[PDB]
């Protein structure tokens, strides 16, 4: 319809499922918006060169913990699900 | 001026909206139009359920606002500016909220006293007319205020019914009486 079409033209599009986008960062913890498929204690990999572990999944938001570095992460970059729990090699 | 203060947060907006629209005597117009422009956001199933909660900047949302008023030109000048205010503070999830409150404020002006007459099961239509008659007769609605009866089915009301409107209620249920009884059993 025309109503949907005027929204579609002025929108960059989003939805935010299986990726999320950061809202604010600092204290060596970050706040990402979305990520409603994540597992509890999963590892996420950021598109900035850093990995973090989700600790608090709150409705409609997630609080990742950044394993070093506060520089790489900035508000508006995309956080992606690795899809596996945090593990370490054993053997 | 506002007539009475109702609602907590996101009612500061609704309050403010009625008192601005009060000076012209066109709140009824403003509110109707708001229902029709809100519904056309909903019948935008993507980006009108997927952009109520913050997800994009203030500015993109503002431009989503500009696009909503260019496609619907009847919205009244108070509600075309209220949207601007909401977009700049960067909120749209409590958009239905100001709308709902603004309806209550408006219908206090119309002089409608909205009411739910929950029952266990849907009652007959005759039972309805008679409740509307009676409730008018009873001093809970002094007259001057036009009651509406809205039927609801709640099988969680286990037997009986509850008549609710304003701050005045008559609870003539079976369900409560059972709960009270069950506790009371000692012998």
From Swiss-Prot, chain A:
Transmembrane segments: none annotated. Disulfide bonds: none annotated. It comes from the Eukaryota. The modification Phosphoserine is found at residue 11. It is found in: Mitochondrion inner membrane. Belongs to the ATPase alpha/beta chains family. F-type ATPases have 2 components, CF(1) - the catalytic core - and CF(0) - the membrane proton channel. CF(1) has five subunits: alpha(3), beta(3), gamma(1), delta(1), epsilon(1). CF(0) has three main subunits: a, b and c. Present with 41500 molecules/cell in log phase SD medium. Mitochondrial membrane ATP synthase (F(1)F(0) ATP synthase or Complex V) produces ATP from ADP in the presence of a proton gradient across the membrane which is generated by electron transport complexes of the respiratory chain. F-type ATPases consist of two structural domains, F(1) - containing the extramembraneous catalytic core, and F(0) - containing the membrane proton channel, linked together by a central stalk and a peripheral stalk. During catalysis, ATP synthesis in the catalytic domain of F(1) is coupled via a rotary mechanism of the central stalk subunits to proton translocation. This is ATP synthase subunit alpha, mitochondrial. It comes from Saccharomyces cerevisiae (strain ATCC 204508 / S288c). The lineage of its organism: Eukaryota, Fungi, Dikarya, Ascomycota, Saccharomycotina.
Swiss-Prot record, chain B:
Gene3D superfamilies: N-terminal domain of the delta subunit of the F1F0-ATP synthase (1.10.520.20). One of its GO terms (biological process) is proton motive force-driven mitochondrial ATP synthesis. InterPro entries: ATP_synth_OSCP/delta_N_sf (IPR026015), ATPase_OSCP/d_CS (IPR020781), ATPase_OSCP/dsu (IPR000711). GO terms for molecular function: proton-transporting ATP synthase activity, rotational mechanism. It holds the Pfam family OSCP. It is found in: Mitochondrion; Mitochondrion inner membrane. One of its GO terms (cellular component) is mitochondrion. HAMAP family: ATP_synth_delta_bact. Present with 32400 molecules/cell in log phase SD medium. Mitochondrial membrane ATP synthase (F(1)F(0) ATP synthase or Complex V) produces ATP from ADP in the presence of a proton gradient across the membrane which is generated by electron transport complexes of the respiratory chain. F-type ATPases consist of two structural domains, F(1) - containing the extramembraneous catalytic core and F(0) - containing the membrane proton channel, linked together by a central stalk and a peripheral stalk. During catalysis, ATP synthesis in the catalytic domain of F(1) is coupled via a rotary mechanism of the central stalk subunits to proton translocation. NCBIfam families: ATP_synt_delta. F-type ATPases have 2 components, CF(1) - the catalytic core - and CF(0) - the membrane proton channel. CF(1) has five subunits: alpha(3), beta(3), gamma(1), delta(1), epsilon(1). CF(0) has three main subunits: a, b and c. Belongs to the ATPase delta chain family. This is ATP synthase subunit 5, mitochondrial. It comes from Saccharomyces cerevisiae (strain ATCC 204508 / S288c) (Baker's yeast). The lineage of its organism: Eukaryota, Fungi, Dikarya, Ascomycota, Saccharomycotina.
């Amino acid at each position: 319809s025309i109503l949907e079409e005027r929204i579609k033209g002025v929108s960059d599009e989003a939805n935010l499922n299986e990726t999320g986008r950061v809202l604010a960062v600092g204290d060596g913890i970050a706040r990402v918006f979305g990520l409603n498929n994540i597992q509890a204690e999963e590892l996420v990999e950021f598109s900035s060169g850093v990995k973090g572990m989700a600790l608090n999944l709150e409705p409609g938001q997630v609080g990742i913990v950044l394993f070093g570095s506060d520089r790489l992460v900035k508000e508006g970059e995309l956080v992606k699900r690795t899809g596996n729990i945090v593990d370490v090699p054993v053997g | 001026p506002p007539p009475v203060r109702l609602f907590g947060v996101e009612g500061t907006y609704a309050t403010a909206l009625y008192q601005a629209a009060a000076k012209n005597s066109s709140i009824d117009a403003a509110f109707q139009s708001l229902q029709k422009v809100e519904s056309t956001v909903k019948k935008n199933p993507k980006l009108g359920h997927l952009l109520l909660n913050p997800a994009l900047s203030l500015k993109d949302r503002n431009s989503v606002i500009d696009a909503i008023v260019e496609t619907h030109k009847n919205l009244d000048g108070y509600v075309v500016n209220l949207l601007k205010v909401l977009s700049e503070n960067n909120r749209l999830g409590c958009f239905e909220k100001i709308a709902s409150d603004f309806g209550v404020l408006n219908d206090a002006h119309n002089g409608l006293l909205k009411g739910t007459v929950t029952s266990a099961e849907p009652l007959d239509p005759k039972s309805f007319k008679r409740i509307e008659k009676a409730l008018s007769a009873s001093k809970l609605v002094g007259q001057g205020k036009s009651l509406k009866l809205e039927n609801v089915v709640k099988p969680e009301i286990k037997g009986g019914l509850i008549v609710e409107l304003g701050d005045k209620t008559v609870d003539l249920s079976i369900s409560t009486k059972i709960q009270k009884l069950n506790k009371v059993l000692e012998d």
